[PDB]
């Protein structure tokens with residue numbers, strides 16, 4: 001099995017070391033290993049080296065991804081790579097687009113795109129402003145539905161490479177990801193159990209009568225039993241979870257419906273007139 005490790009830090013920084021230490025654990029379990037430093041890549045925002053990167057991810061059986069924490073989440077570059085997964089890696093649309101290709105004599109999209117795959121994440125921050133990065137990491141695996149094995153957070157980690165026990169945790173994440181790639185089907189999540197019995201997430205959006213898992217998006221309720229929190233929801237909701245084929249199909253169907261309504265609305269006079277007034281009112285300032 002091939003384990004691919006990706007670092008989002010500075011060249012030769014702590015994320016490099018944590019991600020390389022994990023590759024070592026993966027080689028210890030008999031995996032072939034490869035390492036990509038994102039600072040060498042040119043990746044444009046979602047309106048260039050991206051297709052190369054995605055191609056490498058497709059050939060790997062498992063991936064370890066180490067990102068720095070910026071403002072209690074992953075880097076803008078991580079977010080960009082998440083943005084740029086949608087058009088290409090959504091398990092839903094690729095199942096659909098494959099079927100349609102078969103049934104209309106289309107050409108069969110890249111098979112690797114639909115292969116099950118395992119992925120692990122480590123978030124390395126310099127202080128404890130780290131409340132959002134795990135959920136960021138999950139988001140990236142949610143679009144292709146890659147089975148997440150570990151999704152660890154490492155606060156107060158400026159000097160982590162001389163803290164042997166945390167370096168060792170990263171070696172164990174390397175182990176886990178290789179063992180899991182040995183049998184992607186029966187691989188099982190190894191990380192924190194968290195609060196969402198489904199997502200494992202600990203991030204929730206809270207309004208009156210509705211708590212929503214920020215990762216998987218079940219709407220449910222959050223219960224405080226003497227300072228311990230838990231998340232319950234109605235078993236209908238599993239049908240809609242954003243990390244299930246069922247919920248993706250629902251989500252994609254509603255997108256196609258509302259994109260048709262949009263295309264029709266853009267031919268009304270209401271739309272055209274309102275747009276024509278906006279252009280008349282003001283023009284965008286650009287740098288000379």
Ligand SMILES: Cc1cc2nc3c(=O)[nH]c(=O)nc-3n(C[C@H](O)[C@H](O)[C@H](O)COP(=O)(O)O)c2cc1C
Pocket residue numbers: 008009010011012013014015016067068069070071072073124125126127128129130155156
């Ligand atoms: C713009 C910026 C924002 C950051 N925000 C956070 C943060 O919110 N919480 C945190 O622990 N660390 C934060 N850090 C520190 C980084 O996580 C740290 O520099 C990084 O893990 C270094 O990794 P490297 O050695 O791989 O480059 C931030 C750093 C920068 C440059």
Ligand SMILES: O=c1cc(-c2ccc(O)cc2)oc2cc(O)cc(O)c12
Pocket residue numbers: 125126127128129158
């Ligand atoms: O090492 C750090 C560097 C920075 C940073 C980023 C930009 C600046 O002008 C000054 C500091 O923010 C941080 C925020 C944190 O929560 C933790 C850090 O280690 C850092």
